[PDB]
Structure 1
Amino acid sequence: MLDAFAKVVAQADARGEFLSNTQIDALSKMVKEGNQRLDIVNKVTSNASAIVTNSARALFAEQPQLIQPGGNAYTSRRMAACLRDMEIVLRYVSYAMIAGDSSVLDDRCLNGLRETYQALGTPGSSVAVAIQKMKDASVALANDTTGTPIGDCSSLVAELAGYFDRAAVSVV
């Protein structure tokens, strides 16, 4: 895997170039955010059990056929594996948020997830609804203050929303 600092280095080694003066000034801004990025990863991780469970609770209220006999989440092994997957996706979205690059997200979670759910019969349109419910529980948790100093984080919540949309289109 490689983060956002290692991303521009790998793009520059393949050209055989030193980094520019403009490119160092663009990596100073990524360090200048710095603490605001670590606030989003702190808020998402600290409420990780309640984000997964209460957005599984709201999925079975709107699609109650998934827990009927003959549904894809009806049994204890088949329900516990469903909550386990929703915690796997929230894990690698927080990994992609601390790194600034969606490379650990697809190389270790997403590549082969569509092929897995097509061999098992898991409804892929219902997985993306569970992904989109953890999204707006987390982008509403991102832009509340709650012991953070007041400022503008609207550029880092568009990046966190883009990692949830990436995980949702790799399964739908």
Structure 2
Amino acid sequence: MKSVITTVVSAADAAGRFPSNSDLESIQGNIQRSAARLEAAEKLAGNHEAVVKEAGDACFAKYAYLKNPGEAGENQEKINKCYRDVDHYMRLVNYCLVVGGTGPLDEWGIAGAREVYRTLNLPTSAYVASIAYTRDRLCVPRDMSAQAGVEFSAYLDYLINALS
């Protein structure tokens, strides 16, 4: 769970020293950003029915071959579990925009990701098609502020780079 405080406390812990001015300095960086990266968590928390519906069918629009017989979404519960997965991923992005780190993305969606999908034959292109669609559906002055728009997109492109 790499946040900004977990980074400095464990770094001080290695040498068994007392939190010095380096370690105190990093926490005020989680004061100036964190007044406005939590408004993105407001935008994600109240809009999450619509942003995972709008991104859930974007991958099926790009990849219509999945809905055939004996594929990722062969039947209806395949699509239900796919929308479940897009909801899970946007929840971890909402966590990362809150904590101030990529911890909850890493150890809950990114660690062991490739393995599962590979064995479960879940195309990675379908998963990145939704997050990439959500990244460019956002325009800055309508949905959030300027500080929120960059930090919300930065957690999305981090997961895009991690998934493929």
| TM band (smaller chain) | 0.7 to 0.9
How far apart are the structure 2 equivalents of 1:129 and 1:77? 20
How far apart are the structure 1 equivalents of 2:92 and 2:128? 15
Question: What TM-score do the two structures reach when normalised by structure 1?
Answer: 0.81
Structure 1 position 144 matched with structure 2 position 141? yes
Aligned-residue Cα RMSD (Å) equals 2.3
Question: What TM-score do the two structures reach when normalised by structure 2?
Answer: 0.85
Structure 1 position 75 matched with structure 2 position 75? yes
Query: Are residues 145 and 127 of structure 1, via their aligned partners in 2, closer, same or farther at CA, if it must alter by over 3 Å?
Result: closer
Offset of residue 22 of structure 1? 4.7
State percent identity of aligned pairs.
Answer: 26
Query: Are residues 152 and 56 of structure 1, via their aligned partners in 2, closer, same or farther at CA, if it must alter by over 3 Å?
Result: closer
Tell me, yes or no, if the aligned pair for 1:131 and 1:164 is still in contact at 8 Å. Answer: yes
How far apart are the structure 2 equivalents of 1:81 and 1:157? 29
Tell me, yes or no, if the aligned pair for 2:95 and 2:104 is still in contact at 8 Å. Answer: yes
Q: Equivalent residue for 1:167?
A: 159
How far apart are the structure 1 equivalents of 2:107 and 2:91? 14
Offset of residue 69 of structure 1? 2.8
Moved more, 101-110 or 162-171: 162-171
Structural mapping, 1:2-151, within 5 Å = 3-137=3-137, 139-140=138-139, 143-144=140-141
Tell me, yes or no, if the aligned pair for 1:114 and 1:170 is still in contact at 8 Å. Answer: no
Offset of residue 97 of structure 1? 1.1
Tell me, yes or no, if the aligned pair for 1:3 and 1:99 is still in contact at 8 Å. Answer: yes
Tell me, yes or no, if the aligned pair for 1:38 and 1:98 is still in contact at 8 Å. Answer: yes
Tell me, yes or no, if the aligned pair for 1:45 and 1:94 is still in contact at 8 Å. Answer: yes
Offset of residue 64 of structure 1? 1.6
* Partner SS state of residue 72, structure 2: coil
Moved over 6 A (4+): none
Tell me, yes or no, if the aligned pair for 2:3 and 2:100 is still in contact at 8 Å. Answer: yes
Note the residue ranges of structure 2 that are not aligned, 5 or more in a row. none
How far apart are the structure 2 equivalents of 1:51 and 1:152? 19
Q: How many residues align?
A: 164
Offset of residue 30 of structure 1? 1.8
How far apart are the structure 2 equivalents of 1:77 and 1:170? 27
Deviations 1:69-116 (A, max 9, x none): 343222111111100100111011111111111112111222112111
Q: Which has the higher helix share?
A: 2
How far apart are the structure 2 equivalents of 1:164 and 1:80? 22
Opposite residue 97 of structure 1, the aligned amino acid is L
How far apart are the structure 2 equivalents of 1:131 and 1:102? 16
